């Protein structure tokens, strides 16, 4: 059966107690518990030329990897060999990295596959702020989606159907309660 409101759900169809969700442990086989509990970090997945290290599964841009400062959780980025570029028949380009070098597909919305010897188009819709409400994949592309009350503008943004009355802002300035318009041009006192 599905999870209750006091539980958390996993990609494999597994249910977990809510307290375990961000306790610092991989109670979820997909590691969905600790997916982003660190502020502004990403775990077990990477933007187009970022690189992840065994210590805690955190991903960092390749340029900083061998820069001389430990960026990985365990400092594993700081070492910086090249040998595997000789071994690999990978399709594009190599970088000097610990564990004998690394190979990466062209930066423009592509990334490495099941091994560095192969490549696929990038996971657009994984970018924070790429769309206002929902995102879908397309052939070499991505598409926005807005819920039923909204209409889609500028290819990125969702705005509200004019059927509904114009949005208002209600705020207090200490002594008084004020009403205003979303454009910020007019203000009146409600109480």
């Amino acid at each position: 059966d599905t999870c209750g409101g006091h539980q958390f759900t996993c990609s494999n169809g597994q249910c977990i107690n809510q307290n375990w969700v961000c306790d610092g442990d991989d109670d979820c086989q997909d590691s969905g518990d600790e997916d982003g509990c660190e502020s502004n970090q990403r775990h077990h997945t990477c933007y187009p030329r970022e690189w992840a290290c065994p210590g805690s599964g955190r991903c960092i841009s390749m340029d900083k990897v061998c820069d001389g400062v430990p960026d990985c959780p365990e400092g594993e980025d700081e070492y910086c060999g090249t040998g595997l570029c000789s071994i690999l028949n990978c399709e594009y380009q190599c970088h000097q990295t610990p564990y004998g070098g690394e190979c990466f597909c062209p930066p423009g919305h592509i990334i490495n596959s099941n091994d560095s010897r192969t490549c696929i188009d990038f996971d657009d819709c994984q970018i924070w702020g790429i769309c206002d409400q929902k995102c879908e994949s397309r052939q070499g592309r991505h598409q926005c989606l807005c819920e039923e009350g909204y209409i889609l503008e500028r290819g990125q943004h969702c705005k509200s159907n004019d059927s509904f009355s114009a949005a208002s802002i209600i705020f207090s300035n200490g002594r008084d309660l004020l009403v205003g318009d979303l454009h910020g041009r007019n203000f009146r006192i409600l109480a």
Binding site: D35, S172, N173
Partner: protein
């Protein structure tokens, strides 16, 4: 998120967000009140490296909300069955 799983910073810094108190959200933007700015401010929901001012006050503004239909969507009420 509702489960606390993915965490993102919209803005930070003493100069940008010195003393926020109240926050409200609509479409692309978040509206927040700041006692150090003595202002009501507008920012972008995903990232804003330079918030803007919607209203300037001589006193510290406390509370802010957005009034619109889509902020209060409809749903069924279980208590309708004779309370």
């Amino acid at each position: 998120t509702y489960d606390g799983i993915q965490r993102k910073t919209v803005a930070r810094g003493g100069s940008l967000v010195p003393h926020p108190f109240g926050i409200s959200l609509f479409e692309e933007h978040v509206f927040f009140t700041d006692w150090t700015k003595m202002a009501v401010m507008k920012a972008n929901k995903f990232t804003d490296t330079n918030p803007q001012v919607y209203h300037q006050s001589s006193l510290t503004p406390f509370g802010v909300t957005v009034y619109h239909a889509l902020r209060q969507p409809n749903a069924t009420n279980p208590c309708g069955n004779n309370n």
